[PDB]
Amino acid sequence: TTLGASIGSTDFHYLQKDYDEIKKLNLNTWNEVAWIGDELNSKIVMWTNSSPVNNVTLSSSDFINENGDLISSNNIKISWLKETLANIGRSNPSAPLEPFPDIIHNSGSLNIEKNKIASAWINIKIPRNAKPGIYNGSIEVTADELEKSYTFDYSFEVLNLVQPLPSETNTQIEFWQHPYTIARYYKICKEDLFTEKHFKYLRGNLKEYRNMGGRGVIATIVHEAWNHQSYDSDPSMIKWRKNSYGTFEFDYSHFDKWIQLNIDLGILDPEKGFGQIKCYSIVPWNNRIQYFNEATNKEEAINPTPGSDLWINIWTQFLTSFMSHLEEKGWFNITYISMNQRSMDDLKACVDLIENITNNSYEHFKISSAMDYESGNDYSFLDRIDDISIGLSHINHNSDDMKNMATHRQELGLLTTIYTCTGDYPSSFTISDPSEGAFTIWYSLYQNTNGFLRWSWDGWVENPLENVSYKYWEPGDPFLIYPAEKDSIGKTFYSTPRLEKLKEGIRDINKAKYLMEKAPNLKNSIENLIYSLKRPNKGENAYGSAVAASKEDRDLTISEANRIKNGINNFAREFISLTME
Numbered sequence: 001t002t003l004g005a006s007i008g009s010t011d012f013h014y015l016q017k018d019y020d021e022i023k024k025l026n027l028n029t030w031n032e033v034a035w036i037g038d039e040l041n042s043k044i045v046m047w048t049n050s051s052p053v054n055n056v057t058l059s060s061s062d063f064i065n066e067n068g069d070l071i072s073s074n075n076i077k078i079s080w081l082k083e084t085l086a087n088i089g090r091s092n093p094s095a096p097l098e099p100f101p102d103i104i105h106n107s108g109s110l111n112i113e114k115n116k117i118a119s120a121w122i123n124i125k126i127p128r129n130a131k132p133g134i135y136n137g138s139i140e141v142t143a144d145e146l147e148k149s150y151t152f153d154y155s156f157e158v159l160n161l162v163q164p165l166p167s168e169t170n171t172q173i174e175f176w177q178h179p180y181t182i183a184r185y186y187k188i189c190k191e192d193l194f195t196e197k198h199f200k201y202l203r204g205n206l207k208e209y210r211n212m213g214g215r216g217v218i219a220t221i222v223h224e225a226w227n228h229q230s231y232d233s234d235p236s237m238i239k240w241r242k243n244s245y246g247t248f249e250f251d252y253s254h255f256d257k258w259i260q261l262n263i264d265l266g267i268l269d270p271e272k273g274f275g276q277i278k279c280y281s282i283v284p285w286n287n288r289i290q291y292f293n294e295a296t297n298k299e300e301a302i303n304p305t306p307g308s309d310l311w312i313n314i315w316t317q318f319l320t321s322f323m324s325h326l327e328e329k330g331w332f333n334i335t336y337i338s339m340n341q342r343s344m345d346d347l348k349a350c351v352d353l354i355e356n357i358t359n360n361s362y363e364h365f366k367i368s369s370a371m372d373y374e375s376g377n378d379y380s381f382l383d384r385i386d387d388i389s390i391g392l393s394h395i396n397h398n399s400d401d402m403k404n405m406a407t408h409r410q411e412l413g414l415l416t417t418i419y420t421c422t423g424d425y426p427s428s429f430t431i432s433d434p435s436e437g438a439f440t441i442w443y444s445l446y447q448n449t450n451g452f453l454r455w456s457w458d459g460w461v462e463n464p465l466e467n468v469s470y471k472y473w474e475p476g477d478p479f480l481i482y483p484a485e486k487d488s489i490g491k492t493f494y495s496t497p498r499l500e501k502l503k504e505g506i507r508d509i510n511k512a513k514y515l516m517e518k519a520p521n522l523k524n525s526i527e528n529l530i531y532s533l534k535r536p537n538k539g540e541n542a543y544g545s546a547v548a549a550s551k552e553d554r555d556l557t558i559s560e561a562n563r564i565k566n567g568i569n570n571f572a573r574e575f576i577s578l579t580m581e
């Protein structure tokens with residue numbers, strides 16, 4: 001024909017290079033299991049031949065159960081997956097530059113060049129007041145050059161249990177946001193920073209974060225704290241100045257507006273002790289603190305070594321001032337001072353200083369850190385850090401070091417997460433299989449942590465919608481959402497399949513934690529299922545990017561994700577049965 005069509009997996013990308021392989025698909029039916037308030041995703045893959053094809057459109061019926069309960073077609077959003085270019089290597093500028101369908105772009109029609117793949121993401125939101133049962137419906141695909149329409153048989157079962165709202169779970173999610181990057185992309189001026197004109201491009205993507213379970217909000221407290229690793233500079237949200245007497249003063253304006261925005265959006269609730277403010281960092285890159293010297297009237301920097309007399313002096317000034325400031329705002333209880341991977345000497349100097357500065361109630365700042373922990377059961381220092389996150393590449397699957405460490409922390413009421421970054425596999429890159437994200441989240445629970453941290457909400461390059469290639473890291477590493485087009489009406493961001501799979505993983509670990517809690521009798525059955533998870537092997541492509549070791553390892557990430565999900569849905573059904581009989 002002029003146009004071919006088939007249901008396809010959301011687990012991996014359908015790429016142009018796989019054209020000839022893809023044209024041989026003909027999957028016409030789809031079924032899945034969801035809870036009330038849950039979501040489901042699917043995909044239809046289309047193709048063209050010698051001739052191009054205009055105005056390709058897809059559309060969805062209403063969905064109806066056996067009691068004629070309705071889920072409107074408006075809960076089904078079908079979006080073209082837009083392709084963007086990606087250098088497939090890591091700091092390898094001569095690596096091949098290939099298209100990946102990494103963007104959940106727009107609804108409506110689309111043209112398709114000769115001999116091309118195009119795919120459309122399908123997202124189904126089950127309303128929070130939906131009735132249980134088996135729902136059926138269909139999705140149609142048509143075009144202009146086609147005098148016919150293809151048809152696709154979709155059903156799904158809603159189980160009689162309500163997907164927990166994020167605030168009803170104990171899942172920890174922290175994605176680092178870069179609000180100045182949002183300002184740069186959308187040409188927000190210096191003077192409009194953290195005003196309503198800025199907030200308009202932040203609210204949507206922050207709501208999105210909140211709704212998938214985000215609780216951590218990063219705030220920079222010194223300038224360029226990651227040495228400009230990213231496309232955009234990282235300004236400090238707290239401006240430092242040295243006055244004529246030679247003591248430091250701090251301007252909290254940006255920090256205050258940023259945090260207040262996050263309080264207004266419900267990510268943070270400092271009165272109720274919810275959410276975290278992560279202050280980056282007491283160990284910024286090379287210990288460098290840049291400041292305006294009012295005396296010499298110029299910009300200067302210092303680089304004092306942790307533990308040194310100058311260091312203790314300066315951070316004592318900041319921490320003391322910051323604590324008082326946060327106490328007047330009522331924010332102090334949810335505030336953490338962040339560290340990062342440093343020498344044990346630097347880390348101990350930090351924890352020792354921080355612990356030594358207290359308010360009237362002898363409360364000190366909480367402390368948060370990426371740590372490299374991989375073995376041994378000496379927790380005495382690690383327990384003085386209130387939130388830690390461990391890179392997946394430092395977690396040894398052939399041991400229970402990580403899980404034992406995490407379990408100790410849960411007992412003491414401390415937070416623990418894992419993260420992925422450059423060099424990790426599974427991970428959440430543009431070139432990753434999106435299923436890897438669901439796996440990652442399940443791995444956080446397999447390790448008995450509270451959840452997942454990633455550095456990379458929104459660190460856009462110049463024009464990521466067209467090319468995400470950046471000089472460091474696997475492509476797409478620095479962002480899980482895309483921006484909208486600069487002229488958008490409109491939308492302020494687009495989601496990605498990789499992010500939707502993180503979201504799936506999170507909802508699905510939330511189902512498992514909910515069951516464990518509400519059906520104590522199923523708990524060890526569930527725990528055993530979780531603890532059966534296998535870990536695929538990390539390989540590396542010809543150009544420096546981490547990837548799956550082999551086809552077997554790709555398949556395992558998918559099979560394992562689905563296995564566990566299904567297992568949990570069966571436990572779901574067991575609990576539901578119990579209630580009915």
Ligand SMILES: CC(=O)N[C@H]1[C@H](O[C@@H]2[C@H](O)[C@@H](O)[C@H](O[C@H]3[C@H](O)[C@@H](O)[C@H](O)O[C@@H]3CO)O[C@@H]2CO)O[C@H](CO)[C@H](O)[C@@H]1O
Nearest residue numbers: 226229340341370391419420421422423454455473477478
């Ligand atoms: C939490 C997070 O994602 N942080 C980084 C992330 O960095 C990874 C890890 O957290 C770092 O400790 C490590 O940093 C350096 C390492 O400790 C040094 O011994 C070595 O000489 O240089 C390392 C820098 O490569 O780096 C790893 C990643 O390689 O990585 C992401 C990029 O995906 C961002 O840089 C986050 O800021």
